């Protein structure tokens, strides 16, 4: 099982999700889910073709992964913000916090020296602030909606919080960090997480609709 095989698997999974969401497509929600998995599909194909594998010191960094995350994770937060009924100002805070996490990870991965752990730490701090907004203010806000919408928000929120919290550990234990986990295992774990936090996320929304 090679890296390219794992990338192709993620590509196929994202593509199936993309077509499923487009078919089922309230247009805003369905269009967002197409963007979430559609962008990831492209990133995985590019990586499957061997494009964007950047050598850094003694590790290999996958640049398309971080461009993907920077564009798709704010769309996931946007989806959750619509469910919770955020005003346009609360959106700005959480999307700003999200972008800090994603940019810090991208920069830390691309830096060869130990300064990269300083960048990782900053993303960790901003992530804790993002979790606070999901579990607190956004949950208060979602409470004002129908019982079914509130229930859907809580289920997507917990899926999001629990799984997103695993990524920094995979990053740190993998090549970008202490380089303990091997690239193949590290990639396999992230392909699984990407698929669940995007396509699984999406199908839980379809089921409730
Ligand atoms: C579809 C892709 C998803 C949901 C990716 C999520 C990625 C994260 C939650 C990554 C978080 C990170 C930290 C909290 C600190 C810095 C390193 C990151 C980017 C792995
Ligand atoms: Cl990486």
From Swiss-Prot:
Main location, first listed in the record: membrane
GO MF annotation list: monoatomic ion channel activity; photoreceptor activity
Compartmental location: Cell membrane
GO cellular component: plasma membrane
Cytoplasmic topological segments: 85-87, 143-146
Gene3D superfamilies: Rhodopsin 7-helix transmembrane proteins (1.20.1070.10)
Topological type in the membrane: Multi-pass membrane protein
Family per similarity comment: Belongs to the archaeal/bacterial/fungal opsin family.
SUPFAM superfamilies assigned to the protein according to its UniProt record, in alphabetical order: Family A G protein-coupled receptor-like (SSF81321)
This protein's record includes keyword Transmembrane helix: yes
Organism (species): Natronomonas pharaonis (Natronobacterium pharaonis)
Keyword Magnesium: no
Function: Photophobic photoreceptor responsible for the negative phototaxis. Activates the sensory rhodopsin II transducer (HTR-II) in response to blue light.
One Pfam family cited in the UniProt record for this chain: Bac_rhodopsin
Keywords: Cell membrane, Chromophore, Membrane, Photoreceptor protein, Receptor, Retinal protein, Sensory transduction, Transmembrane, Transmembrane helix
Record-annotated membrane-spanning stretches: 3-24, 27-48, 63-84, 88-110, 115-142, 147-174, 183-209
CDD domains for this protein: 7tm_SRI_SRII
Alphabetized InterPro entries for the sequence: Arc/bac/fun_rhodopsins, Rhodopsin_retinal_BS
Extracellular side: 1-2, 49-62, 111-114, 175-182
GO biological process: phototransduction
Protein name (record): Sensory rhodopsin-2
């Amino acid at each position: 099982v090679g890296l390219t095989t794992l990338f192709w698997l993620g590509a196929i999974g994202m593509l199936v999700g993309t077509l499923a969401f487009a078919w089922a497509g309230e247009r805003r929600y369905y269009v967002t889910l197409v963007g979430i998995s559609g962008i990831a599909a492209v990133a995985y194909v590019v990586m499957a073709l061997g494009v964007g594998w950047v050598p850094v010191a003694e590790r290999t960094v996958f640049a398309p992964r971080y461009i993907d995350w920077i564009l798709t994770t704010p769309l996931i937060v946007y989806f959750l913000g619509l469910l919770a009924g955020l005003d346009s100002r609360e959106f700005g805070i959480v999307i700003t916090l999200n972008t800090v996490v994603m940019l810090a990870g991208f920069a830390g991965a691309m830096v060869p020296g130990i300064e990269r752990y300083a960048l990782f730490g900053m993303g960790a701090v901003a992530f804790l602030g993002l979790v606070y907004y999901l579990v607190g203010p956004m949950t208060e806000s979602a409470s004002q909606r129908s019982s079914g919408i509130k229930s859907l928000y809580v289920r997507l929120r917990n899926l999001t919080v629990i799984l997103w919290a695993i990524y920094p550990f995979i990053w740190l234990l993998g090549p970008p960090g202490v380089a303990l986990l091997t690239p193949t295992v590290d990639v396999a774990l992230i392909v699984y997480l990407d698929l669940v936090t995007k396509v699984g996320f999406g199908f839980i929304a379809l089921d409730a609709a």
